[PDB]
Each structure stands twice: as C-alpha cells, then as structure tokens.
Design a protein around this ligand. Structure first.
Ligand SMILES: CNS(=O)(=O)Nc1nccc(Cc2c(C)c3ccc(Oc4ncccc4F)cc3oc2=O)c1F
Ligand SMILES: CNS(=O)(=O)Nc1nccc(Cc2c(C)c3ccc(Oc4ncccc4F)cc3oc2=O)c1F
Ligand SMILES: Nc1ncnc2c1ncn2[C@@H]1O[C@H](COP(=O)(O)OP(=O)(O)NP(=O)(O)O)[C@@H](O)[C@H]1O
Ligand SMILES: Nc1ncnc2c1ncn2[C@@H]1O[C@H](COP(=O)(O)OP(=O)(O)NP(=O)(O)O)[C@@H](O)[C@H]1O
Ligand SMILES: [Mg+2]
Ligand SMILES: [Mg+2]
Lengths: 254, 305, 256, 291
C-alpha cells in the first residue's frame, strides 16, 4: 500500500501553484515533492484513489517517480524531488545552450517516456514543457499525467465535440508542440496577444505553429516528424512507437 | 469636452494624488493581507494594507515564467499607469516582482466588480447601466485621447465600483509585453471578444465597444447572452463570429437603451458606432441628465464587497 | 502484481554483463535483465519475494524495479544504471573521491536503507558490490534476492553465529552499512591480510577480530569515525538505526 | 619408484606441448563440481589434445593485484610429484581466473565417500601415506603449506594414483578468497581457528579429521558453521569407534587430532608410525576398488 500518514511528512517552502494544486518541497525519506490538490472538502475521493492506481502503474526512468499519496487532511501526491529546472525554464527563461544532439536526446527521452505511458494505457492529457524536468541536467522526467495550457492543446481538444477528445493522438500533438519548442527555441504563436484568438483559430484549423522558425540545423526527418505530430486530423498523426523508432533510427545515422 | 471633470471629480482626483505622494517605493514586506478579493485565469487579487502609509490597496499577483529582461520591461511599461489619472480609471500605486510573482498594487474599490454586483442584484437596472455606459465611454476615450491606449479586456469583472458612487475601469493593455506573456494561458469559459478580433484584425477601440455592449446585455438580463443553456469556450467563440449578435428583450427596456446596444453590437467594426456617436446618443444623453443615486443603490440595495 | 509481468516478445537481450546472469537489454529503453528454468517449489517463493520486495520500493536510492518475465525462466527487469559499482570505484578503478562526496554517498546509502527499514525490509545482503553510483552521482541499492519483509566481510557477528533470537535485523543491516563506511573512509576492504576464512568467521563471530580503524584516512572527520565505530559495534543492541545515522550525517554535513 | 618415475616423465613430456592457454581453445565436456569460491569443469584443450580440469574463480581485484596472483602460481610448474596434482597454466579474463590442472577421473574422495558410504581402513592407509608424502614434498621441496586439507581436496584416478590439490601457492589469492560466503563445513585446527600462531601441524589435524570422516562416512564433529568452529576450539576431538577399527589406526588419528600442535605428531613421526608402516606393506588393489 502507498498511503502515507501526514505525520510522517514535513512541508517546507511552497514552490508554486499549477492547474491541479500547489507543490511544496517536503521531507519524507529525503527530499520529496508534495502536490496538495485544490479542494479541501472531499466530495464523493475515490477518483483520487483511482488516479493513484494509474500513477502506481508507472516504473520508468523517464517518468516522474510516484512515491505515495495522502488522504488526510486533504488529498496530496508525493513524488521524487527533481533538482534542476523544467524544460520550459531551460528553453524560454534561462536560454540554456543546447546542441542539436542534445535537443534530439531530450526529444528521444520524452518520446521514451510517452511510449511507456501509452503502452500502459495512460493518456497524459496535459503534456507540456513545464511538466518535463531535466533531472540532474541529464534525464527527462515527465510528470502530472493522468490527473491544460492552450499552446499544447490539439484542435479536437479545443473543440470538445468529437467522441473521446483526449487520446494518444492528442498527447502526440502536445508532444509535437514540445518538439516545436526544442527545434525553434520559442513558444508557438510568439506574438499573438489575444488568448481567445489563438483558441478559436487553432480549434477550426485556421492557425498552427510556424515551422519557418525551425532552426536550419534541425534534420529534415525531424521537421517531418514534427509536422506529422502537429497534423489537424488526429487519425493521421503517428503513435509513439513510430515516433520513438523514427528518432532512434535517425540518431544512429548522425 | 467629455474628458472634463466636475468639482467633486477634481477634488477626489487631487485627493487621491495627495494620498499617492506619501507612498513612495513598494516592497513585499510592507504589505499585510486583509482578505482575498478574487482570482482569474492567471491572477489573484488581495485586499492589502500598506503599513508605511496606512493605505488599503488591491494587490494583483500575476505568475509568469519569463526572462528577467522581459520582467523588468513589464515593470517598466506599467509606469505609464502613473499618468492614467481619470475619474473613470482605477488608480495605480506601483508594480514590483517578488517570488516569481509580478505584483500590481492599485486603488481598492470597496464595491467590487459589476460581475460580483450582478450576482447579488440578479439584474442591474437600466438607469444604473446608463451611468455605467457613460463611465466606460469616457474611460475608453481618456485612454485613447490621453495615452492612445486600447482596453482589450472590457467585461463586468473589469468594471469596478465603490461606495462613493465612482465607476472605473481596470485591467487594460498598458504593457504590450504583459499582453504577450499572458497569452500563454489556460482555456477560459466565456468571451466578450469581438468577432473581428476572434478572426485577426488589427486592434481597434471598436472591439472594446462590442465588449461593452455584450456586457450591458448580460448585466441587464442577468445571464451571459452568448451561447445556449451550457457550452465550451470554442463553441461560444463560434457564435460570436458566425451567429447574429445578441439583443435586449423588447418589452421592458427602453427603445433608447435597445438601440444603444445594437449600435455597439454591429458585427462590422466600420458600421459599428464609435466613441463619438455613442457619446451623443439618446440613451447616454438621457442618462447623463437623469439624477441617479448610485452610491445609495450600491450601499443600501446591494451592499459592499 | 501481474500487471508487472512482461512478455518475452517485448524484451530484447544484448550484451552479457556477468553472473544469476545480467544482460543489458531493451524494453522501453535501456534496461537490465537478471535471468535467475522450471522453478523448484521454493525458488518460486523466493522469486515471489525479491519481486514482492522490489514492488514495495519507490525511492530514488533504490534500484528501480520495472517488471518480471516468467518465460523461458524467471527474470527481473530493472533500470539500466550508467557507471560502476561502489566496489569498482573503491577497490578496482581507484576513483578519486572528495571527502564531501564520500559523506554524500554515505548519506544516500543511509537514505535508501532508512526507506527499506521504514517498509519493514531487511536487505540482508548490503555490500559495496550491490551499491551502484548511477551517472556518478546517485546511489542505487540493488540485489534484493535475499531481502525479506515483516560474503563475510559485511556480515555482523550475530548473523555469523546463527544462535541469537532473530539473527537478521535492522541492526545487522546497520553493521553491513558500517563496513561500507569502512570502505569509504579507508579505501580498502576489512581484514585485508588475514588469509584464513574460518578464522575471520570464528574471530569476528566471537569478537576477536574487527575492522582496523587505524586505516581511516586523515581527512575523515571525527564525527564520521564515531559513526563508523558505532555501526560496527559487536553487540547489535548498541548499533544505531538509520534515522539516527541520518541525523548524525546531516549534522556533520551542516558544518563542513 | 620405477613406475612413478616413468609416469612423471610421461606427464612432463605431455606438459612440454602445452604452452600458453587462452579462453578460445577449450570445449567443455562436463561439470565436475563447485565450491565456496570456484567451480571445476572437465575440458578439452584442442591445441594440445589434452583433457584437463578447469577451475574458474571469480575475482574483482585491482589490475596489479590480478597480475600478481597469475605469476604467484607459476611455482606450480615446479611442483612435479606423484602425490601432487599437475599444473598446466592459469590465466585471467574479464573478472574470472581459470586454473588448468591434470584431470582425475575418480574425482575427490568427498565424491567417492558418498558412493562407498565408508572407505575401508586398508584404503585409508594408502590415503594416509600419500597425504603425508604429499605434504612432505611441499614442505621440503617448496617450503610452503597446504592450508586446506579435506576430502574435497584429495583426488584419485582409475590408475590408482592419490594426489593433492588446492593448497596455498598464491598468498594474495588466499587473502582474496577470504572475501567469500559463509561455508558449510569446518576442517580447521582449533589454534588456526583461534588466532594467528599456527604451522603445518594443522594440515595433520585436517587430514586426521578427514580420515575419521571417510572411515565412518559422517562428518564427525557434531549445526551452523560457527557452532562447529566453537566445537573445534572447545570440545575434545572426535575419534573412531573402538570395536571396528584397529588400535593402530585408532592411535594414528588420535595423535593427529591432538589439539595442541606441539604434542601433535609431525610428518617425521607419522612416517614411522605403526599404522603407516603396516599399510605400506599391505598389497591392496586400490585401482580396482575405485573403478
Ligand atoms: C482578453 N483580451 S487579450 O486577450 O487581449 N488579453 C489582455 N487584455 C488586456 C490586458 C492584458 C495585459 C494587462 C493586464 C492584465 C493588467 C492588469 C492590471 C493592471 O493594473 C492596473 N490596470 C488598470 C488601472 C490601474 C492598474 F493598476 C495593468 C495590466 O496591464 C496589462 O497590460 C491582456 F493580456
Ligand atoms: C580453508 N583454508 S585457508 O583458510 O587456509 N585458505 C586457503 N587455503 C588454501 C589455498 C588457498 C588459495 C589457493 C587455492 C584455492 C588454489 C587452488 C588451486 C591451485 O592450483 C593447483 N593447486 C594444486 C595442484 C594443482 C593445481 F593446479 C592453486 C591455489 O593456490 C592458492 O593459493 C586459500 F585461500
Ligand atoms: N517533482 C517535482 N520536483 C521539483 N519541482 C517540482 C516537481 N513537481 C512540480 N514542481 C514545481 O512546482 C511548481 C508548480 O508545479 P505544478 O503544480 O505542476 O504547475 P505546472 O506544472 O506549472 N502546471 P500543471 O502541471 O498543469 O499543474 C513548478 O515550479 C514546478 O517546476
Ligand atoms: N482594484 C480592485 N479593487 C477591488 N476588487 C478588485 C480590484 N481588482 C480586482 N478586484 C476583484 O478581483 C476579482 C478577480 O480579479 P481578476 O484576477 O482580474 O479576475 P478577472 O478580471 O475576471 N480576469 P482578468 O481578465 O485578468 O481581468 C475581480 O472579479 C474583482 O471583483
Ligand atoms: Mg507540473
Ligand atoms: Mg480583472
């Protein structure tokens, strides 16, 4: 069993508040991350315990390590503490210098983690560069899965009309935007100031990331893989077994 | 002519500027929280006490993961608000960065937003909405004439009132970098956006006029008028662009008020009324002459928050 | 439980690493595959334990269990660690380690052991060979084939005697941790000249022989020497537990 | 004698065509046995056409310490005796050390004891002679010790030869093999178990305990290994029953299991003991009893 008594956990500095809850750096057999969920009054509860059974299914080096959960006083998730910064921070805040060999490696490790999740029948539903940690400045850690921001949302998720809007392919499109960040060094729609305009256009197909910013140093097979992940029709987007194999075969031919 | 102040307006503005001089530089340790006023798509607002001066302010905290230079430029572009002194614009004390949060300290409005008032009142009376329509038109005109600034976010939650009967505007695009940095947002639930902007035109005050008219309809009937029943943001964004604009019911509201919102909700921005036509419109001319005790209606009939 | 079983069609074996037998393999990336074929009635209960022990471990200082295979035989899949074992770093490659690093490896090893004991896991086989420095930074404790739920160089005396009530305990793990401390602070293995194996068994078991703390390096702090000797105490009742070991290490770390 | 001189010259003739041993030159025939630190396999060396016993010992040691052990065993090239197993070569490769020696088709007496149940006294007399002669060869011609006398290290073959193996020729290999797991049986003299001071007299203790074990077919001390070690140090030694075995053989094991190494017999005294001179006169078909 993975429930942890709240007496065993000491909460330290607040780190930030996301869409799901607030993250604290904590102490429970070493440094840990504790995400305290939004609401305090537990309605129904079992959904939390059901979500925890999804996190219990993950044992992969590219997946953020789930360590335990707390049901009192509120619902909280305990994960490993990542020392370092997110991929969003490295790309858009600190302007860290990465070679193309490193960008494809991050793209490979991210595909390695997503391929594991989908092989375990797990749709991430909220993949983005903020939820990708470069642990030790070396290993990709994907977090906040099976528990978003419009820049990584597919058109069918924006519309919320089609049957099953969240799928493997919606995760693939989110991965495609992460590829866009790695290859261009910037966020999609870099100077479209209206939030609602960005939404309505993408959902209808009128707008899409600008592949002209893709660095010249990016291999042509990566640009094609990127555009395939960004396709408007979800049925035409490749699954991660193909994405991962495409990158792994491309890397062997440096 | 309509950017002019009456004696009470000019006394209150100089009174605010007198209180403002004794403030100075703002720091996080000088603030103590009184209560949380609300939250939005990216920001949370607190009622705070500034210990050195004893002033109560509204402190909006915006979390942004941006480069330090962009952070400094946002703080540097918000200094324009020191020059935005108008009876129809919320005051500004300062802006600073701390703990990954850009903090914007502004004038506290003890009446809150009209989105909060509407939930209490159910419906806001037409005479009250006439004084609201005047303050928005004069507020937008001041931004366009005195600073050539567009609002880009007119809606009931950004129309603030206070116990002295003042109606002021807040949360307008003074910093272009803050507009860009807040575009990386989460999906909303509503939109007061003009169809021309939802499609891609260069920004113009006609969009704000549409947002005002859509707000007037909501506050007049007590229901978000775009959509059906519920709907999601995209489907609502579809209506605005394709479906015809909403309108007030015919029976209760005056023909002057009905024609006022229709000229604001014309979907083509060239045929839509500008800020000069609406200023000399029947509803505005009638409302400006009417003697409405707005401070009494807010304090006695609705309450304060 | 069964959701961790992996079909052999999904797993690829590459280079043999050594001897069961460990292979570098491929299953959703680089992995390690330990092939432990028709199991005897007890070894099935044994594999049921190392897997059940590993299924209860979710900690950065414990080797990441990933799955198991039942065909052609029993096999365990774990993460692939890049680097070498602590035994290799200390007794083979002569790796240059700062004192702050040696204390950090001692801290991380105590961090993983404290997690195991909080889960009522007695590793029963902690040694420098079973401690891996992944990417030269993170301690990863492995080899849970003898672990349980509730060589002789790392063996406590009460375990070597097999007479006292419940020989294997938290304290027997602490002594094994103490010998690992001896390796970190002295750079050598205990009893590194006594040739007779049974002598070591009888002498250590009776108390006539102990690790020679005169080989401790000069740059080793005094608080680390006392923690070392306290973990090596003959009477298991006086050896400290890992919560107290962590508080001692965190104390000496706080001021150089 | 004449037969032993011809067999040693024949072995030296076959040894000249060996040379260097490498991993790729072998094909395994069968697995002979494994122990606390090594496993032995019957192998075929294609370059010379000889069958050998290949002992594999796993050791993760520094490169200098690994090079020392390999040439520390080259002394075995000088250990040519009818009571000592021959030596072909030894080499290291990727963490394990291989030792190639002469194959003994009869195995160890530990394996022969399990098949016979008990070894007759007349056979043990021929065994006692070869162990005393083998130890005397190592002490006078090579001035070392055996350190590990037990039935597992007494090998026999179809031709009736009795030889010894697994003695201390490489001193650091001794210290390296100390890093081993808890053994299963004990054959150490109490003074060896106790402390540092010891001598070749402990080899006489270990064969005395070996003789009693092979005579009654049962490990005579008696439990976990530590309890056995405490028994050797404390309790008096075991002895053969009175009615079955001869008083000469009874007196032989008692003087070989005397706990004090100074009162215990030396290789010079046992050579001229009543039990040794008696069995040397006996004509026993050792090759037939083994085959
Ligand atoms: C939905 N429309 S949109 O998509 O165009 N988004 C945007 N719309 C409009 C503006 C912006 C950015 C913005 C924000 C949000 C802002 C908030 C508070 C503020 O303090 C005060 N405000 C007024 C008076 C006194 C003050 F102290 C200044 C601000 O200045 C700003 O520039 C947007 F992102
Ligand atoms: C419980 N006894 S103890 O505690 O005293 N330890 C020890 N006892 C005895 C020895 C050692 C180490 C050792 C061993 C084991 C060894 C084995 C084989 C070998 O090759 C041949 N040998 C003889 C004939 C033919 C050969 F091919 C050389 C060896 O050389 C060695 O030195 C010990 F560690
Ligand atoms: N395991 C972790 N280790 C270290 N920092 C973490 C960890 N998980 C989250 N954080 C940080 O905690 C803060 C808030 O995270 P979070 O609550 O996930 O918001 P978010 O990731 O930005 N958006 P979302 O994931 O959709 O809720 C960020 O600064 C993260 O970098
Ligand atoms: N100066 C102020 N004085 C009093 N209440 C305020 C003030 N500013 C904001 N509020 C309240 O704080 C609430 C939340 O503010 P805010 O974060 O701006 O939400 P929002 O306006 O709906 N989103 P946005 O588009 O950024 O304006 C509003 O609904 C108001 O009731
Ligand atoms: Mg996150
Ligand atoms: Mg607002």
């Amino acid at each position: 069993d993975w429930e942890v008594p709240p007496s065993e956990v000491q909460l330290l500095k607040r780190i930030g508040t996301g869409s799901f809850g607030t993250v604290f750096r904590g102490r429970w057999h070493g440094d840990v991350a504790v995400k305290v969920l939004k609401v305090s009054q537990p309605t129904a509860a079992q959904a939390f315990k059901n979500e925890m059974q999804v996190l219990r299914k993950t044992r992969h080096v590219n997946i953020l390590l789930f360590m335990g959960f707390m049901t009192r006083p509120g619902f909280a998730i305990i994960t490993q503490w990542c020392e370092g910064s997110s991929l969003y921070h490295h790309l858009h805040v600190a302007d860290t210098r990465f070679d193309m060999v490193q960008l494809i490696d991050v793209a490979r490790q991210t595909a390695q983690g997503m391929d594991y999740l989908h092989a375990k029948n797990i749709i991430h539903r909220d993949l983005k560069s903020n939820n990708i940690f470069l642990h030790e400045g070396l290993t990709v850690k994907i977090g906040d899965f099976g528990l978003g921001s419009v820049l990584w949302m597919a058109a069918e998720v924006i519309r919320m009309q089609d049957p099953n809007p969240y799928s493997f392919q919606s995760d693939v499109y989110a991965y495609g935007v992460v590829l866009y960040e790695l290859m261009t060094g910037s966020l999609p729609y870099s100077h479209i100031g209206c939030r609602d305009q960005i939404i309505f256009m993408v959902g209808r197909g009128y707008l899409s990331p600008d592949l002209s910013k893709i660095s010249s140093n990016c291999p042509k097979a990566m640009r094609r893989l990127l555009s395939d992940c960004l396709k408007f029709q979800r049925e035409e987007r490749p699954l991660f077994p193909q994405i991962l194999a495409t990158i792994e075969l491309l890397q062997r031919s440096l | 002519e309509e950017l002019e102040l009456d004696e009470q307006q000019r006394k209150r503005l100089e009174a605010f500027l007198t209180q403002k001089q004794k403030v100075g530089e703002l720091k996080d340790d000088d603030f103590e929280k009184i209560s949380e006023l609300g939250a939005g798509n990216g920001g949370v607002v607190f009622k705070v006490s500034h210990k050195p001066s004893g002033l109560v302010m509204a402190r909006k905290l915006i979390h942004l993961e941006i480069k330090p230079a962009i952070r400094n430029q946002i703080i540097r572009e918000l200094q324009v608000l020191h020059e935005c002194n108008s009876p129809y614009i919320v005051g500004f004390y300062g802006a600073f960065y701390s703990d990954g949060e850009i903090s914007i300290c502004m004038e506290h409005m003890d009446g809150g937003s009209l989105d909060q008032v509407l939930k209490k009142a159910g419906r806001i009376p037409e005479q009250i909405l006439g004084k609201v329509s005047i303050a928005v038109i004069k507020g937008l005109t001041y931004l366009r004439e005195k600073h050539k600034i567009m609002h880009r976010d007119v809606k009931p939650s950004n129309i603030l009132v206070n116990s002295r009967g003042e109606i002021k505007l807040c949360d307008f695009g003074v910093s272009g970098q803050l507009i860009d940095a807040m575009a990386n947002a989460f999906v909303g639930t509503r939109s007061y956006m003009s169809p021309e902007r939802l499609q891609g035109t260069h920004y113009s005050v006609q969009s704000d006029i549409w947002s005002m008219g859509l707000s007037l309809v909501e506050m007049a009937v007590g229901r978000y008028p775009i959509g059906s029943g519920s709907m999601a943001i995209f489907e609502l964004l579809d209506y605005i662009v394709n479906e015809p604009p909403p309108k007030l019911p015919s029976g209760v509201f005056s023909l002057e008020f009905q024609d006022f919102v229709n000229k604001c909700l014309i979907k083509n921005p060239a045929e839509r009324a500008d800020l000069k036509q609406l200023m000399v419109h029947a509803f505005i001319k009638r409302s400006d002459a009417e003697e409405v005790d707005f401070a009494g209606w807010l304090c006695s009939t609705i309450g304060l928050n």
